Amino acid sequence: EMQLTPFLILLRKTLEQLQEKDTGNIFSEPVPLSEVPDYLDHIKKPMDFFTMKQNLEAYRYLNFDDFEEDFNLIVSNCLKYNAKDTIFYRAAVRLREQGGAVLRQARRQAEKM
Ligand SMILES: CC(=O)c1c(C)[nH]c(-c2csc(N=C(N)N)n2)c1CCC(C)C
């Protein structure tokens, strides 16, 4: 229950804040399946911040939980695919932590709308 335009503005700002936490830009674009031929063997739904931006602009996120679910996929896919002793795995842990804080604040803003 709220106006659509301010909610989308909030999600755009939140998505920018989450991307800023991915300093290596390793989550900015889809995992290149040509370079990782086995990626889809066990990853059911790839996700990345560019796809999230597309989904946002296509009006596919109309509540906070659907936005947060796709962010959580970025994290969970990376934890699943990569071994614990890799930079990629630790980057996903760091994004989970830093992004979680961004998301809690953004949700508190939405609840005032
Ligand atoms: C495995 C994984 O989880 C990846 C995540 C989160 N991002 C990327 C990525 C984005 S862009 C790019 N570019 C090149 N040239 N590999 N790799 C990967 C695949 C990395 C390869 C080297 C195993």
Numbering used by the authors: 627 to 739
Give passages from the manuscript.
Bromodomains are protein modules recognizing acetylated lysines (Kac) in histones and other proteins.
The common pyrrole ring is sandwiched between side chains of Ile652 and Phe714 on one side and Val657 on the other, also donating a H‐bond to the Ile652 main chain carbonyl. The piperazine ring of compound 1 and the guanidinium group in compounds 2 and 3 form a salt bridge with Glu661 side chain. Interestingly, Glu655 could have also been reached by the compounds charged groups subordinately to a 180° flip of the thiazole ring.
